[PDB]
Nucleic acid binder design. Sequence first.
RNA 1: GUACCCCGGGAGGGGAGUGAAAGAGUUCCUGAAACCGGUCGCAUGCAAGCCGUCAGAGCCUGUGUGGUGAUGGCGUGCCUU
RNA 2: GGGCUUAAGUUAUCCGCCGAAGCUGUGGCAACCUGUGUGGUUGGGUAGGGGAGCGUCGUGUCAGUGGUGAAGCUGCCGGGU
Lengths: 210, 132, 48, 102, 119
Amino acid sequence: ETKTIDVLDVKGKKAGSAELPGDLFDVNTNIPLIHQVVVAQLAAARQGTHATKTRGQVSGGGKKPWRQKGTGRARQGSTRAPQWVGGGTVHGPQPRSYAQRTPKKMVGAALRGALSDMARDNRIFVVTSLVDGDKPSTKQAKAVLSGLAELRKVLVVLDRSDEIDWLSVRNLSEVHVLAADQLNTYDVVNARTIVFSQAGLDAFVGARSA
Amino acid sequence: MSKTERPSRRAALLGDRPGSYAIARHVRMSASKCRRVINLVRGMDAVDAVTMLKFQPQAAAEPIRKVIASAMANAEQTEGLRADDLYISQAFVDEGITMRRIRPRAKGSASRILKRSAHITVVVEPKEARQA
Amino acid sequence: AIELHDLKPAPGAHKAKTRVGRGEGSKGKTAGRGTKGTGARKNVPEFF
Amino acid sequence: MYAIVRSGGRQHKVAVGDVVEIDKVADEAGSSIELTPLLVVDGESVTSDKDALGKVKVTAEVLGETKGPKIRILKYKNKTGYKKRQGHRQKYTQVKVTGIEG
Amino acid sequence: ARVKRSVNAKKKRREVLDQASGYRGQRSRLYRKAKEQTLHSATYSFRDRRAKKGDFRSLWIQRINAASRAQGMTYNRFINGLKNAGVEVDRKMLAELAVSDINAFNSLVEVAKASQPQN
RNA sequence: GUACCCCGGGAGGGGAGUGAAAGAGUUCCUGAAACCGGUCGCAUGCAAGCCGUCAGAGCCUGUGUGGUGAUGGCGUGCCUU
RNA sequence: GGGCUUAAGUUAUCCGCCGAAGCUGUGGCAACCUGUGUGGUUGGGUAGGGGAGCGUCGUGUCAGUGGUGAAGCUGCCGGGU
Ligand SMILES: [Mg+2]
Ligand SMILES: [Mg+2]
Ligand SMILES: [Mg+2]
Ligand SMILES: [Mg+2]
Ligand SMILES: [Mg+2]
Ligand SMILES: [Mg+2]
Ligand SMILES: [Mg+2]
Ligand SMILES: [Mg+2]
Ligand SMILES: [Mg+2]
Ligand SMILES: [Mg+2]
Ligand SMILES: [Mg+2]
Ligand SMILES: [Mg+2]
Ligand SMILES: [Mg+2]
Ligand SMILES: [Mg+2]
Ligand SMILES: [Mg+2]
Ligand SMILES: [Mg+2]
Ligand SMILES: [Mg+2]
Ligand SMILES: [Mg+2]
Ligand SMILES: [Mg+2]
Ligand SMILES: [Mg+2]
Ligand SMILES: [Mg+2]
Ligand SMILES: [Mg+2]
Ligand SMILES: [Mg+2]
């Protein structure tokens, strides 16, 4: 299935039409592959700043606590041995990075399938803009009522071409706003609708396509 | 929870029966040595108990006596009962805080000394409750 | 419409870790090493 | 009047109106099953021959399904580390004897 | 992700100390002693569940012997006679008769007597 | 952060007050186990016991399930090595 | 061991019986193979190999839930291999 389809550019009521090129927005949704890509994405978000002290890094503990023989006590070599209260930790966490070297083709295919899953569910909308003039949150909150204001993702273009739209949707808390060059599988699988801006869809389609 | 009659010492020692009680907490005497006298005093008439404890050679007889007297006094103030028609219905000794100390022994050794304490509880009731 | 909670791996993709020395219902006590000797504690070099 | 009857590798002494526990059968509650008689005692009269016991029918009514006691098995041998935990219930069929007709 | 052991650890301790809730001394109070005793109890109970069959059969055989010797027949001859007569009443029901219905047992003794080889 | 009253040399307690809660009273959130006891039920002073297990009377309870359990059989701990 | 020659001793022979977690009966569970509508075989186990799971903590998402009472602790009545 690679049929390119036509969707209604809206701007509230009606505008021109926009193509969903099929090579993306109509491909197989691969659940294992999308799961791998999303897990890798959530692993790359990990700070990984967890460390513990081994028996050599704990303060003191240099000298033998008592003699090897004759005391009637068990043999001990240090006060910071791991079985001591206050001693070192054996296999505790140490700082690490969790980012995975996922192949590019897999990431692109997973984003494609995630987009197609809801292009076939008719949850993708294209608008010219969400706001006229200055930055209201009320106006584009009214405008994003192409569906229920719940788990929506607003795809706008650049950090400057849609400054007004970005600042408008910034505070909705049920809207995740992305630039078209930063489209990722996690935010698409998380979204219940995608609302592209016209220029955002243009940027995404031009960046990656056949 | 949201239930009535929060637990109390009176409800567990007497439970709507006439009578009273007293507790001497943190008595600097071992629980076993207090029990050696409490076993004598349990079940006896209260006035007989205090007069006998006046003559008991043991050191724990002076704390326990006071507790009994206090219990009697309480019964003479919240219940209107007289001292001569009260009997020691219940009596027990629990352990208190035990302090740790060191006694130096021979050859650089130190042995442990435990300074034990006791809580003494005495519950008195009218003599008519002995058979009821 | 897949949503994030319906993403699951392929069957057999994520094999469970075998945690050793966690009781004798599994590889417990000696943890697969046997008793005594060199192999009980370190390893043997392959050139040896 | 009573009978020694057999029901699934076990024998029971039944009388009319007796609630008896039987090895599980495939029959629904309220159905009427038949127990094969091995002896009939009517008072100073004991039926024991096969030809006469073939005539006698013991009929009972299936009450429901009961459970045996819960059994904990813990197989153990010292100085090996070997243990094996297991459980058992052993469901049965409760039955009410409704007739012993010669 | 540091985990504390108590919440998971106390479950088996509560189970074992509930299973040891009539034992004498340390066996009913301490989890380690109670665990040793429950190992022994499980071995004993598994063994005695199998030995119960033989124990009850021995008791039935003794009672049948006693009841058939009052009628001048030994147990071996009584059992052989019931086998030859075709009456397949097992020793459990035979003992139940020998206690509760002694007249039926005596009639069974007569049946066994009439079915002996007599040789 | 317990006025005041009672027993007491005090400690402690009993009434009372504050507080939603004081068995949240300064040893103060929660308050486990070992361990220490008071009370009640059963058993226990002719008995040889890895302390259990199976069979099992009696008593108490019956919240018709539960506690204890005389007596009979069987039965030499756990781990390491 | 008691006791046994009035054998309960040795011996030959005959007729019965007892006796295991063996075998059969009945009721569950499980592994493998097999025609793929019969079922058959199998299921003691240390070192050890393989397979599949319980519980604890953190965490994405979804659905929630909690002073009309969460966690934790402690009873009783149940449940599963
Ligand atoms: Mg050092
Ligand atoms: Mg060194
Ligand atoms: Mg430290
Ligand atoms: Mg000196
Ligand atoms: Mg071990
Ligand atoms: Mg070793
Ligand atoms: Mg060796
Ligand atoms: Mg080796
Ligand atoms: Mg090297
Ligand atoms: Mg090798
Ligand atoms: Mg061995
Ligand atoms: Mg082992
Ligand atoms: Mg058998
Ligand atoms: Mg005040
Ligand atoms: Mg409380
Ligand atoms: Mg506290
Ligand atoms: Mg006696
Ligand atoms: Mg002996
Ligand atoms: Mg078998
Ligand atoms: Mg096996
Ligand atoms: Mg093994
Ligand atoms: Mg609510
Ligand atoms: Mg928690």
